[PDB]
Design a protein around this ligand. Structure first.
Ligand SMILES: Nc1ncnc2c1ncn2[C@@H]1O[C@H](COP(=O)(O)OP(=O)(O)OP(=O)(O)O)[C@@H](O)[C@H]1O
Ligand SMILES: Nc1ncnc2c1ncn2[C@@H]1O[C@H](COP(=O)(O)OP(=O)(O)OP(=O)(O)O)[C@@H](O)[C@H]1O
Ligand SMILES: Nc1ncnc2c1ncn2[C@@H]1O[C@H](COP(=O)(O)OP(=O)(O)OP(=O)(O)O)[C@@H](O)[C@H]1O
Ligand SMILES: Nc1ncnc2c1ncn2[C@@H]1O[C@H](COP(=O)(O)OP(=O)(O)OP(=O)(O)O)[C@@H](O)[C@H]1O
Ligand SMILES: Nc1ncnc2c1ncn2[C@@H]1O[C@H](COP(=O)(O)OP(=O)(O)O)[C@@H](O)[C@H]1O
Ligand SMILES: Nc1ncnc2c1ncn2[C@@H]1O[C@H](COP(=O)(O)OP(=O)(O)O)[C@@H](O)[C@H]1O
Ligand SMILES: Nc1ncnc2c1ncn2[C@@H]1O[C@H](COP(=O)(O)OP(=O)(O)O)[C@@H](O)[C@H]1O
Ligand SMILES: [Mg+2]
Ligand SMILES: [Mg+2]
Ligand SMILES: [Mg+2]
Ligand SMILES: [Mg+2]
Lengths: 464, 467, 464
C-alpha cells in the first residue's frame, strides 16, 4: 500500500512513509490537541513541497477564521486559494439527509475541479448535531475512496484514555486511526500522538511526544565519533582523563549540593570561548546574574563571552514547562547559535516532578541530538544524599553518559573537603585515584589522593 | 500574529501572552465556587476602567442587582458604571411566577446601543438545562456574536471534576478558546488552578497555574530574570559571618537545616534583629511557635522582640501550615512584603509547610517564595527540621537544596555521654566559607561558635570516634 | 452582611455566618447532620437574637421535630405556642404556587427573619428542579429572609446535589460529609462557595454531641510565661534548669518499657500533692492496672482520685475517631478544669489514622492546652526498640517545646535505660545521656556514660 508524505517532522517516520494513498485517516483527540492544525498542516505541505492542490471541508470554522489561524504559523492560506492550489469548502449552515449526498457532490466537484489528491473533513462529529453515524460515515469514507484521494477525518473525544471516538462508530469504520492526546502529568500537559493501526502496512506502535510551535506540529520518534581530545578548562582534570574530553562525548558531573559541578561547567564553557569556539550554558538552578557574579568570583568574565558572540546563557525554571517543551527549547537555540559545546546545569532539576520514563526519553533525545551533531556536552546531576550516596544517579541514566566526573564531600578531621574522581572514561584511560581539590578565586585546585585514608566513599574517611 | 485583549487579571495576561482572542468567544467552565462569575465580572470592570470600552453582561440566574452587590465586595461600584453608560446587566432570567434567536437579537441591541467590544454571558448552561440541541444553539450564539466583532466570555458548569470540560461535552469545541477553572482539593485542603486548554490560532502557557480569589479579584500565579550583588549582610553572629567570609550575601537564599531544637529558631531570632539594629525592615513567618512563646523564648537571649515590634522594624506573622493551602500561604507572604516592605524575610519553618502536601506543589511554593524574594532584593533565611536527629543522610527530605545559595547545617554530636551541637556552612555561592564542623553552645547571649572536633572521626554520623 | 448562626466554629468558617436575604443550600448523605443544622440555625436566632424562625417539613411530622429537639435539651413546644418558632407541615396526609403562598403568609404572621426548608429533594423531574428552584429562591430573596434549603446526596465526593442542577443554581453552598476513614467515620463540614465576601476553604472536622454541632476550625495567639513547674523527679527538674514550664508542651519518647508510664504517673502526683487538679488520658493501660503499677512506684491514685484532684479516663485508640477523642479531651478538660493534662499515649492514637489526620488532632489538643495556661505531658512509644533516627514516626517534634529521650543501652550483656533532656524551648537543660534505674520509689537518675561511644545507637563501645 503506497503512502503520502505529510511533511510533518516525525510523522513520516511514525507511519513509515506517511498515510496510505486513496484512503481516509481518522485523527480523533480532546479539545486543543492540534486536530485542525494536523489538517491545515497536511494540505499546507502538499502545495509548497509537491505542488498538488488540496480541499478543506469545514463544519463550523469560517473560511476566513482558518485563513487567520494559519497566519500564526506563517502560512498564507489566502495566497494558496487565489493561486488555485487550495480551496476551503464551507459546510457550515449559514443562519440530516441530502446534506451528505449534496456535500459529497460539492467535494467531488472541487476535488475533480482543482485536480487535488489530499482532502480533510474537520470536524465530522459537529455535523451529527451510532447506527446512523457509523452508517452515514461509510458513505462519506466510501465516496472519498471512490475519487481515490487520501483524506484526514477530525473527530473529538471527552475522556483522555476512555473511548477513542464519541459514538463508538467513528472507529471500526476508518482504515487508519491516529490519536492526538494532551495527557495531564499532575499539573503539566504532555501531547502524545499514537497511530492505533494502519490497515495494510506497518507503523510505530505506542505514544510519541510532540509540541505545537511557529513551525507547526514537531513530533519526535525515539527509533530514529572521532578520538579528537578537548580541554575541560582544568589542567589537572584533562590529565585524569588521559589527554582530555572527547570532541564527540557526553561528560556528566555528579555529587551533592556545593560540590563544584557549577564551577566545572563555567570552566568547560569559558575554555571554548578562549579557543574561538562558541558554547551554550543551559541554566535552571540559578539566574544569569548569579552565574556572571559567582563566575566572576573565579574570574572568567561571562559578559565578554556574550560581546564576543561565543557564550549564550539560557536560564529558565525546571517546572516553567514540560520535558517535550524543554527539549524543543534546547535543540532550537543550538541550531540558531551553532555552539561548539553545550552545558545543562543541571539534569536533576529537570527530573523534579517529571516521571523517570519521560526523563529517560528526554536525556536520550538531548544526548542523542548532541552526539549526532559533533557537539561536546556536559551535564550536571545533584545527589539527594550529600554523603554515603551508593548511586551515581537516582534516575538510572549513567549508561547514556560517556565520561563520569564524580565529586563528593570528605570529612577530614573536623573539616569538609571535596574529592574529584573520574568514575569512568569511555574509549580512554582515566586516573583511578580519589584526588582532593580546593576552590579559590582562581577556580579549582586538584592535589594528592587519600592513600593514607579508608572509607572515602562513605564520606567519613579513617586514617591508618 | 493575532489581535489580543488585556483582561487586567493578575497573571492571566502572562498565560495567553496578551490575553484573550479579539472578537472571538472564550469558554470558562468549572465546578460551583471556582470563580466563573468573578472572572467574567473582572473581564468587564478591567476592560472599561482602563481602555474605556463598553461591556455587556447577560445574566441568567442572579438579577441585575446581585452582580452589582456581589461585585461591591472587591470595591467595584457597578452603580457608577451602570449609570455612566459603560456596563449593562442585560437580564435573561426565568420569571419567578428554545428562543435563542430572541436573546441573540436582544444582545445585539445593547452591544450596538453602547458601541461595545466586550461581552460576557453567565452560565449559558441554564438556557438548555440533548447534546445536539445545545451545540446548534451554542454555535449560533458564538457564530452570531462573531459577526458583531465583540469578545464574548462564556461561563458553563461542571458536575464532577477531572472529567468533561463542560456538562454536554460539546461546548468546548463550540468556542475558539477554552479556559478551565478548577478547585481540586488534596485531602481536606482546596487549590484554585486556572488553565488555558486551547487558544485557536496563537500560543499560550500549557498546564495548570495556581491562583487565589481575594478582595482584589482572581490573583493568578504564572521567567528567571532576577539580579545579583556582592553586597554582604550580617547574620547576627560575628563568628558566623567569618565562617561565610564576611557575612551572608544580600540577595541570596539561606537554608538552616538540622534536627529538632539545634538553634534553627535561635539563628532566625538573631537574623530578624540585625535588620532592626541597622534601621532595616524584617518580617518573621512562624508556622510552629506563637508570638507569645516566640517573644518569650527570644527574651532568654537578650533580644527584645516586643521593643522592635513597637519601633515598626519587625513583624511576627504566626499561622498554622494546615490553616490554608500552599496557594493562600504564598499570597499572604507576598501581601505582607508589599505592605511592610522588609529587606530581610524569615520562614520558620519550611518543613512545617511540607507536612501533608505533594513535594511538587511544595517545590513550586519554595520557587514562588524564593523567586519573589530574590527579584525584590530581600534577603531570605529559611529553616528546615530534618526527620532524623542523628545520621541525617540527605540535606533536605523535600530536596530543595539546589534552590538555596548559602546552607548552615546544624547537628548533635554524642561526645563522652553528652549531647553537644556543631554549626557548619555546608556551601556559599560566589564566596569562600569556613569548611570546618565547629562546635557551639547556647546561653543567655545566644550562640557560641568554639573550635572544631579535629581529634574525632565520623562527625556527620552522630557518634564521633577518638583518633 | 451575614446572620450569626451561633454554631460552634461555623461562624468563623463562614467569616460571620449566612448572607442576610439569601438562601444557603446545605446537602449531605443520610445522617450528615442536615436537619440538625437547619434546626440549630433557627433555635439560635430565637433564643439569642430574638428573630422569629419558620421551619418547612415535607417528610418529617411536626410532632417528631420537637420530639428530636429534646435530645439536645431544646424546648420547641414553648417556642411554638410562644409564637417565636412556627413549624409549617408540607408532608401530605396519608401545588408549588400554594407552597410560597402559605410560606410567604407564615413568614409574616410572626414577622419571621430565619427560614429552614428540609428538604428541596422530597418535593421532586429533569430541568423542572432547575426551574422550580429559582421560583422559591427568587421568592425568598424578594422577602429578604435568610433560608437554609437542603439537598440530598448518595456519594460523599460525587455530585454536590441529587440532580446536579441546584449546585450552581444558588449562591452559598455548604456540604456536610460522613466519610468512612476505613472502619471509623469522620464528619466534615465545608463551605463550597459564597458569591460576595470571603470565607474559609477546604474541609473541617465536626462532631455531634448532646449540645448540637461542634465544628473545630483554626485560630496561634495564646500566652507564654516563665512560671516553672516540677515533674515528680527531682533530678529531672534540675536537668531542665528548674523543672518544666506551665505554658509548655512536654513529650516523652522511647521504645517499650523505657519508663514513659512511670514518668507520666509522677507528673500527675506532683499536681495532686501541690493541691492542683490533673487528668490522665490512658489509651494503652487500664484503671485497675494504672492503680497497681502506681502503688508499686510509691504513689497512690485512689487517695488522689477520692480527693477530687486526679481524674483518670481510659479508652481504646479505635473506640472512636480523632474528632470524637479530641471532644472527650476538650470536654473532660473544662468540667474538671485541671492544671496539668497527660496523654498516654499519642502513638496509640496515631496507629490506623493518617499522618495528616493525626497532626490536626495533635495541633488541636496541643493548641488547646497551651491556650488554657495548662501544662501537657504526652507519651510517644517508638516502633524500633533500638536504633531509631527519628524522635517521632509522625514528625510532631516541632509541636513539642520540651522532649524527654528514654532509650535502652546494651551494656556488657545488661539492658540498662538512659534519660536525657533532648530539647528545652526557652530554658537551659543538661545536654548529657544520664543512665537511670526504675525501682519501688520511682526512677533513680544516676551518672551518664562518659566512658562510652555511639550510645545513641543502643550498642556502645567502652573507651578506657
Ligand atoms: N502558534 C502557536 N504556538 C503555540 N501553540 C499553538 C499555536 N497555534 C496553535 N497552537 C496550539 O495548538 C492548538 C490549536 O488548536 P487546533 O484547532 O489545532 O485543535 P483542535 O483539536 O481542532 O481543537 P478544537 O476542538 O478547539 O478546534 C491549541 O492547543 C493551541 O494552543
Ligand atoms: N570566590 C570563591 N572562593 C572560594 N570558594 C568559592 C568561591 N565561590 C564559591 N566557592 C565555593 O564553591 C562552592 C559552590 O560550587 P558550585 O556552585 O559549583 O556548587 P554546585 O555543586 O553546583 O552546587 P548546587 O547543587 O547548589 O548547584 C561553594 O560551596 C564554595 O565553597
Ligand atoms: N536560655 C537558654 N540557655 C541555654 N540553652 C538554651 C536557652 N534557650 C534555649 N536553649 C537551647 O536552645 C534550643 C533552642 O532551639 P531552637 O528552637 O532555637 O532550634 P530549632 O531546631 O528551630 O527548634 P525546634 O525543633 O523546636 O523548631 C533549646 O532546645 C535548648 O536546648
Ligand atoms: N517495681 C519496679 N521495680 C523495678 N523496675 C520496675 C518496677 N515497676 C516497673 N519497673 C520497670 O518499668 C518498666 C515499665 O515502665 P513503663 O510502664 O513506664 O514503660 P513505657 O516506657 O511506658 O512502655 P510501654 O508503654 O510500652 O509499656 C518495666 O519494664 C520495668 O523494667
Ligand atoms: N583504552 C582504555 N584503557 C584503559 N581503560 C579503559 C580503556 N577503555 C576503557 N577503559 C575502562 O573501561 C571503562 C568502560 O568499560 P565498559 O566495558 O564500557 O564498562 P561498562 O559496560 O561497565 O560501562 C572505562 O570507563 C575505563 O575505566
Ligand atoms: N471578597 C471575596 N474574598 C474572597 N473570596 C471571595 C470574595 N467574594 C467572593 N469570593 C469567592 O468567590 C467564589 C465565587 O465565584 P463565582 O464568580 O461565583 O464562580 P462560580 O460561578 O464558578 O461559583 C466563592 O468561592 C467565594 O467564596
Ligand atoms: N441527642 C443526640 N446526641 C448526639 N448525637 C445525636 C443526637 N441526636 C442525633 N444524633 C446524631 O446526629 C445525627 C443527626 O442527623 P440529622 O440532623 O437528622 O441529619 P440528616 O438529616 O442529614 O440525616 C443522627 O443521625 C445521629 O447520628
Ligand atoms: Mg477543530
Ligand atoms: Mg549545580
Ligand atoms: Mg522552632
Ligand atoms: Mg506505658
Amino acid at each position: 500500500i503506497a503512502k503520502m508524505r505529510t511533511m510533518i517532522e516525525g510523522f513520516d517516520d511514525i507511519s513509515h512513509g506517511g498515510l496510505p494513498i486513496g484512503r481516509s485517516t481518522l485523527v480523533s483527540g480532546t479539545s486543543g490537541t492540534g486536530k485542525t492544525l494536523f489538517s491545515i498542516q497536511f494540505l499546507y505541505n502538499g502545495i509548497i513541497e509537491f505542488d498538488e492542490p488540496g480541499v478543506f471541508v469545514t463544519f463550523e470554522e469560517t473560511p476566513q477564521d482558518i485563513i487567520k489561524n494559519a497566519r500564526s504559523f506563517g502560512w498564507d492560506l489566502a495566497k494558496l486559494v487565489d493561486e488555485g492550489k487550495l480551496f476551503i469548502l464551507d459546510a457550515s449552515p449559514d443562519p440530516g439527509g441530502f446534506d451528505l449526498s449534496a456535500l459529497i457532490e460539492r467535494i467531488n466537484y472541487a476535488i475533480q475541479k482543482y485536480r487535488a489528491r489530499r482532502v480533510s473533513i474537520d470536524s465530522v462529529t459537529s455535523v451529527f448535531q451510532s447506527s446512523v453515524v457509523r452508517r452515514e460515515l461509510f458513505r462519506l469514507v466510501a465516496r472519498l475512496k471512490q475519487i481515490g484521494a487520501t483524506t484526514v477525518m477530525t473527530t473529538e473525544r471527552i475522556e483522555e484514555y476512555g473511548p477513542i471516538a464519541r459514538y463508538g462508530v467513528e472507529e471500526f469504520v476508518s482504515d487508519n486511526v491516529v490519536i492526538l492526546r494532551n495527557v495531564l502529568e499532575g499539573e503539566r500537559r504532555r501531547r502524545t500522538l499514537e497511530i492505533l493501526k494502519l490497515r495494510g502496512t506497518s507503523h510505530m506502535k505506542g505514544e510519541y511526544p510532540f509540541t505545537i510551535t511557529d513551525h507547526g506540529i514537531n513530533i519526535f520518534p525515539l527509533g530514529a565519533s572521532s578520538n579528537v581530545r578537548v580541554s575541560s578548562g582544568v589542567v589537572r582534570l584533562d590529565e585524569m582523563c588521559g589527554g582530555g574530553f572527547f570532541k564527540d562525548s557526553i561528560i556528566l558531573a555528579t555529587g551533592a549540593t556545593g560540590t563544584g559541578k557549577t564551577l566545572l561547567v563555567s570552566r568547560f564553557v569559558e575554555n571554548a570561548c578562549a579557543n574561538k569556539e562558541r558554547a551554550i550554558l543551559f541554566a535552571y538552578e540559578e539566574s544569569r546574574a548569579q552565574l556572571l557574579r559567582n563566575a566572576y568570583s573565579w574570574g572568567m568574565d561571562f559578559e565578554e563571552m556574550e560581546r564576543q558572540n561565543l557564550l549564550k546563557i539560557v536560564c529558565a525554571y525546571p517546572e516553567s514547562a514540560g520535558l517535550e517543551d524543554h527539549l524543543q527549547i534546547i535543540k532550537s537555540e543550538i541550531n540558531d547559535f551553532k555552539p561548539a559545546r553545550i552545558a545543562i546545569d543541571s539534569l536533576s532539576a529537570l527530573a523534579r516532578g517529571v516521571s523517570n520514563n519521560a526523563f529517560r526519553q528526554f536525556v536520550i533525545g538531548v544526548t542523542g541530538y548532541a552526539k549526532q551533531e559533533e557537539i561536546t556536552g556536559l551535564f550536571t546531576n545533584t545527589s539527594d544524599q550529600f554523603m554515603g550516596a551508593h548511586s551515581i544517579t537516582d534516575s538510572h541514566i549513567s549508561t547514556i553518559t560517556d565520561t563520569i566526573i564524580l565529586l563528593q564531600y570528605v570529612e577530614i578531621r573536623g573539616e569538609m573537603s571535596r574529592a574529584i574522581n573520574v568514575f569512568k572514561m569511555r574509549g580512554s584511560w582515566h586516573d583511578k585515584a580519589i584526588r582532593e581539590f580546593m576552590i579559590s578565586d582562581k577556580g579549582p585546585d586538584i592535589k594528592d589522593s587519600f592513600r593514607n585514608f579508608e572509607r572515602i566513599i562513605s564520606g567519613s574517611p579513617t586514617r591508618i
